[PDB]
Amino acid sequence: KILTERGYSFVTTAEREIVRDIKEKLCYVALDFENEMATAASSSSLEKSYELPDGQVITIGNERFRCPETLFQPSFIGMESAGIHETTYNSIMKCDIDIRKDLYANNVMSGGTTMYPGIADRMQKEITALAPSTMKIKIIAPPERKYSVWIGGSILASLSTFQQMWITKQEYDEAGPSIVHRKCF
Amino acid sequence: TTALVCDNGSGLVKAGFAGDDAPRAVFPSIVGRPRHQGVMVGMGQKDSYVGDEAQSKRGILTLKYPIEHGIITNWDDMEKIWHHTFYNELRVAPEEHPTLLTEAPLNPKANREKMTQIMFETFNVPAMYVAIQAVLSLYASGRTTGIVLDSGDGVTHNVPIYEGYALPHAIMRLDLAGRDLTDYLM
Amino acid sequence: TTALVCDNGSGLVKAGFAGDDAPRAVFPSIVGRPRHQGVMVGMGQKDSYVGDEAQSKRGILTLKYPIEHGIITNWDDMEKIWHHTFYNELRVAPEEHPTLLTEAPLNPKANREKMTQIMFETFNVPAMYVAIQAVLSLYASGRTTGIVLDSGDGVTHNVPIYEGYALPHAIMRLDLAGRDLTDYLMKILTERGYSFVTTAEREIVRDIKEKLCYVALDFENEMATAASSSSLEKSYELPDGQVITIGNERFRCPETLFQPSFIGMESAGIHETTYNSIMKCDIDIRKDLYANNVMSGGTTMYPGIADRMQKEITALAPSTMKIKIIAPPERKYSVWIGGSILASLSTFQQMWITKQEYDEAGPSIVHRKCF
Amino acid sequence: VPSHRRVNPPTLRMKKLNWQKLPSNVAREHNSMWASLSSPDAEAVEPDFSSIERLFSFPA
Amino acid sequence: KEPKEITFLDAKKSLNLNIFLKQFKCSNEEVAAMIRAGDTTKFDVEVLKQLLKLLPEKHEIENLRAFTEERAKLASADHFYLLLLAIPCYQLRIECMLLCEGAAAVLDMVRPKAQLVLAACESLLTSRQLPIFCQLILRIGNFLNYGSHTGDADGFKISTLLKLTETKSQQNRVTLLHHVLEEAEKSHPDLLQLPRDLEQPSQAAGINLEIIRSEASSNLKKLLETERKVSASVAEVQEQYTERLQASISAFRALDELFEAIEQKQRELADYLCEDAQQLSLEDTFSTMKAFRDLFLRALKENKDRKEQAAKAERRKQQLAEE
Ligand SMILES: Nc1ncnc2c1ncn2[C@@H]1O[C@H](COP(=O)(O)OP(=O)(O)O)[C@@H](O)[C@H]1O
Ligand SMILES: Nc1ncnc2c1ncn2[C@@H]1O[C@H](COP(=O)(O)OP(=O)(O)O)[C@@H](O)[C@H]1O
Numbered sequence A: 001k002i003l004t005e006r007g008y009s010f011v012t013t014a015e016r017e018i019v020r021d022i023k024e025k026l027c028y029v030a031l032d033f034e035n036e037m038a039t040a041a042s043s044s045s046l047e048k049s050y051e052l053p054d055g056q057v058i059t060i061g062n063e064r065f066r067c068p069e070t071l072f073q074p075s076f077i078g079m080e081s082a083g084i085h086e087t088t089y090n091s092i093m094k095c096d097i098d099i100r101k102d103l104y105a106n107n108v109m110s111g112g113t114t115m116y117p118g119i120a121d122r123m124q125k126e127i128t129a130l131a132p133s134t135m136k137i138k139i140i141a142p143p144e145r146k147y148s149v150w151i152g153g154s155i156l157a158s159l160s161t162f163q164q165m166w167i168t169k170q171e172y173d174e175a176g177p178s179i180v181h182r183k184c185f
Numbered sequence B: 001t002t003a004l005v006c007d008n009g010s011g012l013v014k015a016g017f018a019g020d021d022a023p024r025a026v027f028p029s030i031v032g033r034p035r036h037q038g039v040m041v042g043m044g045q046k047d048s049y050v051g052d053e054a055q056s057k058r059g060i061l062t063l064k065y066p067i068e069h070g071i072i073t074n075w076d077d078m079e080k081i082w083h084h085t086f087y088n089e090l091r092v093a094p095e096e097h098p099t100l101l102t103e104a105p106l107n108p109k110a111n112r113e114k115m116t117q118i119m120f121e122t123f124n125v126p127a128m129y130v131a132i133q134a135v136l137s138l139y140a141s142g143r144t145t146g147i148v149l150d151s152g153d154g155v156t157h158n159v160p161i162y163e164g165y166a167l168p169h170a171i172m173r174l175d176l177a178g179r180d181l182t183d184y185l186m
Numbered sequence C: 001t002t003a004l005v006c007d008n009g010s011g012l013v014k015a016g017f018a019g020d021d022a023p024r025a026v027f028p029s030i031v032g033r034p035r036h037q038g039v040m041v042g043m044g045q046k047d048s049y050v051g052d053e054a055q056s057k058r059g060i061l062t063l064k065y066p067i068e069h070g071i072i073t074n075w076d077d078m079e080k081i082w083h084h085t086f087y088n089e090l091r092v093a094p095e096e097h098p099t100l101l102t103e104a105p106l107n108p109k110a111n112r113e114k115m116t117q118i119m120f121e122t123f124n125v126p127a128m129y130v131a132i133q134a135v136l137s138l139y140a141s142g143r144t145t146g147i148v149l150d151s152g153d154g155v156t157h158n159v160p161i162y163e164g165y166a167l168p169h170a171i172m173r174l175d176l177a178g179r180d181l182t183d184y185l186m187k188i189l190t191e192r193g194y195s196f197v198t199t200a201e202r203e204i205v206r207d208i209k210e211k212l213c214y215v216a217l218d219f220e221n222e223m224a225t226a227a228s229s230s231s232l233e234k235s236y237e238l239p240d241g242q243v244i245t246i247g248n249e250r251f252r253c254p255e256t257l258f259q260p261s262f263i264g265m266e267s268a269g270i271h272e273t274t275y276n277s278i279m280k281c282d283i284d285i286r287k288d289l290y291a292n293n294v295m296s297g298g299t300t301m302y303p304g305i306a307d308r309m310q311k312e313i314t315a316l317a318p319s320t321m322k323i324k325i326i327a328p329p330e331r332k333y334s335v336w337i338g339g340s341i342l343a344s345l346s347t348f349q350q351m352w353i354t355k356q357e358y359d360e361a362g363p364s365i366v367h368r369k370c371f
Numbered sequence D: 001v002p003s004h005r006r007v008n009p010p011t012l013r014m015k016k017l018n019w020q021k022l023p024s025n026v027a028r029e030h031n032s033m034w035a036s037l038s039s040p041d042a043e044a045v046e047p048d049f050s051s052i053e054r055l056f057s058f059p060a
Numbered sequence E: 001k002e003p004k005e006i007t008f009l010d011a012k013k014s015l016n017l018n019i020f021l022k023q024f025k026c027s028n029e030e031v032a033a034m035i036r037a038g039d040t041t042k043f044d045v046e047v048l049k050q051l052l053k054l055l056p057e058k059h060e061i062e063n064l065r066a067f068t069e070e071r072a073k074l075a076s077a078d079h080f081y082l083l084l085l086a087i088p089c090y091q092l093r094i095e096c097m098l099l100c101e102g103a104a105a106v107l108d109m110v111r112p113k114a115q116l117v118l119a120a121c122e123s124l125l126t127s128r129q130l131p132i133f134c135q136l137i138l139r140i141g142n143f144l145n146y147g148s149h150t151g152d153a154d155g156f157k158i159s160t161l162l163k164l165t166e167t168k169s170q171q172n173r174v175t176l177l178h179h180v181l182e183e184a185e186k187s188h189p190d191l192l193q194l195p196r197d198l199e200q201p202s203q204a205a206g207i208n209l210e211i212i213r214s215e216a217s218s219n220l221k222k223l224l225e226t227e228r229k230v231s232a233s234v235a236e237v238q239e240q241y242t243e244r245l246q247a248s249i250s251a252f253r254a255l256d257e258l259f260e261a262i263e264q265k266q267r268e269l270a271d272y273l274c275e276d277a278q279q280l281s282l283e284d285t286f287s288t289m290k291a292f293r294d295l296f297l298r299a300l301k302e303n304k305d306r307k308e309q310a311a312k313a314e315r316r317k318q319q320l321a322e323e
């Protein structure tokens, strides 16, 4: 949507893959959105050029950080809800007060969507603003996070006590496809 | 003084006065340049014909559309369109008249920037405004809410407006309109 | 001079004149701000909307409750609520009518302070009083003894009163009522695939809760019946023409009232709260509290709650005691009815707080005068 | 005798502020804040009483 | 195949230890070496918490010491507990590493906040523009309460600054504080440098000082008990840990001296505001001055927006008059 401000129209599904590659390559999380917007309005230092597969070269400025800012400010697309740091803080405040100190220092971020190279300091800043200054805030950001679920599945694959937890063919014939509800959480 | 309403649509330009019912000057936006050689001396042989005069002599003129899918391509051509509808068609002084202009949604910003620059510097105005076309279509409908499927010559866009408020996330633009239908018919 | 009764509950406001039975102005206590930015003209559009006007345009408005669990959060929004219920709904001046007000028990006192400051400075009155909702519910009950379970939109409180003497140590307040039931119903309709994430959808799920939900007499038998057959399934037409159909979630929603471990609250049910508040009293007066269990508030308007309450209390109490649940059909409006009863009393006319008392004692006489 | 007590009386009715009145002997203590302020060498900021009488007075 | 792992544990605890062991990405001999060397680089609070939550039990240690067959027949969990049992005073070493890392974490947590609270008390006792601003508020209130019992006073409490925004004008938009700051923007701008003295009172404590003080005292008591157990232990544990224990007890003793300084400044601030010290004159004063500074800056920002909107309205009126 916002690439049509500079005049780069994208309507097809292949253009969605091209803009997805642009988002994977060029986009990054800003630490302060207003200062980055004022800097991009002031100087053209953040303007970066991308070469398309046909040979055309585009250039984008502030849109490198305006796209992940919808993660922090969901009202950009009209999805009226809280931010993901606010979602995290409300999920923490849904828990008991005894276990909150453990969850404040064990904030794991997985998925390739969290692979922007500015997300950890901004996320720690927003959680530290949301949480009181009592407890330690620590964001766990491994570099291998994009495959980490698969990695955790491989961690769950080779274990010795997982053999009783396997849902067999006989249990499927006995209980339908419904023993997965009572077996897995 | 009297404000001026000038829809610079993709195919046709409709100009006239505020508070009037029918638009005063409805004419297609084309630029006609001569493509064959002139052999008669004198006789007012212009190098560019605009609008209905370009419509009349269209057999010896290469015709150029300045607006392509809601985007002004040639700004000098649009300057000639604005000078023709200001000085030949409506015959008004632009420095004593406020001016409303219409624009398609999801349009590139620099088109609006250069429209502001031409309409404040080339044709200097006391005041001007740029309005979304679907809002004007709902105001011509007279109802406060609704959804406007506005399809001109370059842009077909769907804009819903509820209680006078625009919802920008549901604005859907598709550049398929009557010039492309003409090319498919050709 | 006609006194005013303005029950300002957490979800709804029921306001009107004293000495009347039906509450004259019943409207939800929501404040609607424009969600999306747009100026336009609109022939003088209002910058905020109160109650039924906010309910009418609720698809494009951010709805804010000024009161959360009986406690006013946004005081300016509450002032707009007060201005609409004085000038637009009832169309009366505040400075020519005394105005009785209601309050949940165990309120933090700064709410009462700012309520007195707004009711004497900017919405100035000749007289006002701040009362207890369970006392007015027992006034609408007509008796003098008994324990009242008053369950509004944020606060469910049990208050025992014997011979007009309320026992303050035995008053038991639990912040679990119909807004939390609505939030739990919004949490559990996503099992069937229906998504409700906005505050406008909270009104739709609250209407589903008010129309279709009911208290099960036995939770496990109803759960086994809903798991076995779909005869308990009920349909509901959405405003966009869609039809939903729901099964066990009709009775899973009020079971949070009897079992707060569904939402992770560690406290026991309201029957156990009622039994502990009765057993916190003296042993001589408990027989009158078992015979005069008064249920009020609109949260207790489900058509199975008196039988389940009698079953749980008779399971909890010794069996020789007579268990009786006072459940009037007008228990929704009973706080306003008892407010009209109290403001109509000639003996209550010495108990009002005057403007001169507010000027002499500051905003501090309301702790000494009111309970 | 101090500068802050020398207040001209207002012609119109003025709105009342709410604060708890400190004793004069406690406020004029040598460790207190206000004994140096009661001295005439301190900067006595004179309030524009015409503006407060124009703005904050009671409307009839 | 070899399914006879001769594991003395149950399935769940061996499962959690196999979860716990695999994150180190190395053999358990390196883990036992890092326990024995006391290396705290890979050992934060959570890893040592999980290690102490997966301690070997009495019958497990007895079955490991009664295991007389080949040690390769054991699982990795039982071999890791045999390597753990090979370390002398292993639970003591784990508790020293956990208490040293936790003591460093709580010291870096508490000590800049405690220095902020001490600097807040030092700037609240000594503030430059605060008596002039309080004299202006006193003179304006003595003009406003002329003819009442609250007026003709020589002072007010610190709760009056929270009550400044409660009083509003006829328009109910310009408060008392907004009008005083609109007057002080024209006459005495040095009072607008009031937050520069209050910037160390800014952000308050934000915490309960009794919670961090009890945590610091409990950590200091645990460090003293740990240093007594190391002093009862062997000299290798002594040369590993005694200097770190002594630095931790010395830094927590400096923290307790800092807490006594906060108590002395709390009594001085109670005498500053002419209030008794039995009430909370520490956290309520920090919250009151934090809310006063936030309302002060919000009054500055709202008066700035009011003056900018008035200037833009004057420019729009002049442009409409010119057209
Ligand atoms: N009678 C008709 N039937 C169908 N299409 C028409 C008819 N008259 C005009 N059009 C189409 O509408 C277009 C004119 O649209 P117009 O009102 O000029 O939109 P805009 O002002 O946005 O350019 C022409 O290009 C033509 O293709
Ligand atoms: N038919 C109903 N079914 C279930 N709950 C209801 C019904 N009607 C009202 N309520 C509940 O009653 C509450 C409103 O309380 P009300 O009796 O108006 O007193 P107040 O005006 O003091 O809030 C709302 O929380 C609403 O959920």
Ligand SMILES: [Mg+2]
Residues within 6 Å of the ligand: B007, B008, B009, B010, B011, B012, B152, B153
């Ligand atoms: Mg057009």
Ligand SMILES: [Mg+2]
Residues within 6 Å of the ligand: C006, C007, C008, C009, C010, C012, C013, C014
């Ligand atoms: Mg009410």
